[PDB]
Amino acid sequence: IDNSLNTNIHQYHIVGRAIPTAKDKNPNVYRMCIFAKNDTNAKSRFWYFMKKINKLKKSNGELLACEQIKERFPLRVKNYGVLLRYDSRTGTHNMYKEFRDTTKEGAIAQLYSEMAGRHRARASSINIIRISEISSSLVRRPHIKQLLKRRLRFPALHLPTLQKEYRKKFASKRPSTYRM
Template sequence: MKPETSRQAAFSKVNMTIPMTKEYRIHGSAMPTEDNPRPQVFVGTIFTKNHVFAKAKFFKILEKKYKIKATKGLIIDCKEIPEPSFKEVQNYGIRFVYRSRSGVHNAYKECRAISKCWAIDHVLRELAGRQKLKRSAVDIISVDVVPVESLKRAKTIEFADENVEFPIFTKIVNTKSLLIPSEYNPSD
């Protein structure tokens, strides 16, 4: 039988305190040849889990748009863009394309989050829950900070007010404030 600590460590595999999605800036081009010794350099911003998925998605876009396959391509630079840590919630508008069972669709979603990666993570999880989409079926086109006046979706407008209040349905008693003498406490 394994000790208690190893079972607890194996229970939670996903850390929900950091977003799964990261932003990568990739520079790539076709391989230099005798006919084209200085090929055009392409730059892309990709939102994925890690750099391996980012490179694969970058080459997928290059092959689709410019007919440059991964075997004939070259990655010049792949950097993770560090996420600035904001302390306040912002409104984000995300344009994306997704492939479903019925075809390819353009879509726009708004959400409130503390950073771009959190906003994209929120939208990807919502699409997975509502429409059974995998992360690989969604291509992010743009992520923009949207001012409150320009919001379109009612769900986002509802929480964009500065004086929004949330009701407390059940008040939970703070057990630490209750003083229980040690002579009556059964745990001692």
């Protein structure tokens, strides 16, 4: 495990309720699972979603439960379909994307990197929705379709990345990116 390699996203589960009032004796308790860096950001984003959908904020409400959802199996290969809602500089769109990796945390991190690279959509301008595992049959994007062939194999054209211990400033003769 390397801190540089790993990201900092954890699935969080939040349950909350408005304070019981005289006008409405028992309010409908709400529950929702979201992705964030840590529990404080999870609570903030949860309450923001509350303020946007249901008529309720911090002062006239409170929390009930705040837990962390971790994976059942960290070393399996799955496929994830996630719906989005983001806003461009000139409009607002939604779109559905696919991703393949070990866990929902990595899937969300990969998705955020994808958005930043492909649409310059900054982090605060994103909304995740209805992320769910999907079967191999029902994947909708060919660039993840071809990954699940019967028996994959390919070369290793990636250039070497050696340690600072040996990234010296001089050498004996020209190396080769061919390698194996």
